[PDB]
Amino acid sequence: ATISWSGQEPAYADQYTGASYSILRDQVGYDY
Amino acid sequence: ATISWSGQEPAYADQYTGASYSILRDQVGYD
Amino acid sequence: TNLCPFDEVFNATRFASVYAWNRKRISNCVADYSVLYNFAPFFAFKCYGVSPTKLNDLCFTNVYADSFVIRGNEVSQIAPGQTGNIADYNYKLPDDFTGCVIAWNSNKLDNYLYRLFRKSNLKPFERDISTEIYQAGNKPCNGVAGFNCYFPLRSYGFRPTYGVGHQPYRVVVLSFELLHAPATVCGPK
Amino acid sequence: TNLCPFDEVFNATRFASVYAWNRKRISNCVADYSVLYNFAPFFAFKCYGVSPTKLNDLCFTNVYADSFVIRGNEVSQIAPGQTGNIADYNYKLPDDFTGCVIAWNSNKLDNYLYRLFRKSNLKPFERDISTEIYQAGNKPCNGVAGFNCYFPLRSYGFRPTYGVGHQPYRVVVLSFELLHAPATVCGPK
């Protein structure tokens, strides 16, 4: 379960507001 | 050519925290 | 027809270094983004500014692709300008620049070089392939290694199972350049 | 009257090296502080807290002199309270000691070695001989010289007719210490 926090397009598998993205598919995407 | 701050007499030829100014008989020191 | 190499330059074996990249211009072709947009699992994606859902429509004069194998958590440094030893010395992307970067871990595929600090900060988009001696001290070292003499570049060669956060990452950056009087290079129909 | 010996340690034929400097302890004896100064023409007699009277009035428990060699433009660091691995990485004196430093030229008299990077700074008064290869990078050199891996020692060249700055002259550091078990002291004439 990936999900996109930027208000749109959740993402499904099998932070901060910069711009449009699709990230965090792996475990590297987050910092905490 | 070299003035000693300690007030003791320098040696006549024919800048840091130091005590004895019976030194500088050579061109090693000085700028 | 006439698809851009894309996959070949991305699935390429014997990937290059990090301090010394290879900016490849992609000439006139029709490039489907489906292979890049959707892939086999993993293979993270990190695209800023303009987004593919409207790049499928609009056209771009030309594009450059750059590839490298940066390791570690410092993959965050390839982002809008952030101060970090990778960023200001292994080149920094400009703030106004709106290209996109895709990264994934490489362990099955994989002696390599990693650039060391420079005498000053470096502007975006120039290579620093350079083997000289870095002059930290006021005393002119002017030769072999000594005090304040450091020869740049480092290595991490043959590092299996060095840590899940330490595994070799690799990332590719695409930049869409629109010079005056566009010529060609559009999306799929 | 077993006069305290200084001619042998200053007029020694084989002067040893700064890498392996011969610490010489002088036992109980009576000194003649006349040959100490006004030696052969041209020399340095820098010291911190030396009036001849308090030298000649009484002598002390024991003394451990040291001798070594450097070129011209490094006699700043032999003086205490100084940095610079040119001499710091081979020698260092505490801010509280009260010995002297003596310098005299040896261009007419004259392979010699040079200390180089060391894992860390040393306190006053140790000893370090190390043929073990030094490393400054992540790759373990673990053998012959390689990337960032250099031979730990360096020569001096001793080239005649070199510049006035780039010529060697030798230095003896004299330490006067009074230690515990006071009932040994030393007796004037």
Residue numbers in the entry:
A (entry chain C): 49 to 62, 100 to 117
B (entry chain A): 49 to 62, 100 to 116
C (entry chain D), D (entry chain B): 333 to 442, 450 to 528
Q: What do the authors of the reporting publication say about this deposited model?
A:
Due to the inherent instability of VHHs and RBDs, a mask was created using the density of the RBD‐VHH dimeric region. Subsequently, local refinement was performed to get a density map with a resolution of 4.05 Å. The amino acids F377, C379, V382, S383, P412, and Y508 on the RBD can interact with IBT‐CoV144 by forming hydrogen bonds. To investigate the static potential of RBD and VHH, separate calculations were conducted. The results showed that the VHH at the interface of the interaction carried a negative charge, whereas the RBD had a positive charge. As a result of electrostatic interactions, the two proteins formed a complex. In addition, the interface area between two RBDs in the RBD‐VHH dimeric portion (456.8 Å2) was smaller than that in the RBD‐6M6 dimeric portion (562.7 Å2), which affected the stability of the RBD‐VHH region.
Here, a nanobody called IBT‐CoV144 is reported, which exhibits broad neutralizing activity against SARS‐CoV‐2 by inducing the conformation of spike trimer dimers. IBT‐CoV144 was isolated from an immunized alpaca using the RBD of wild‐type SARS‐CoV‐2, and it showed strong cross‐reactive binding and neutralizing potency against diverse SARS‐CoV‐2 variants, including Omicron subvariants.
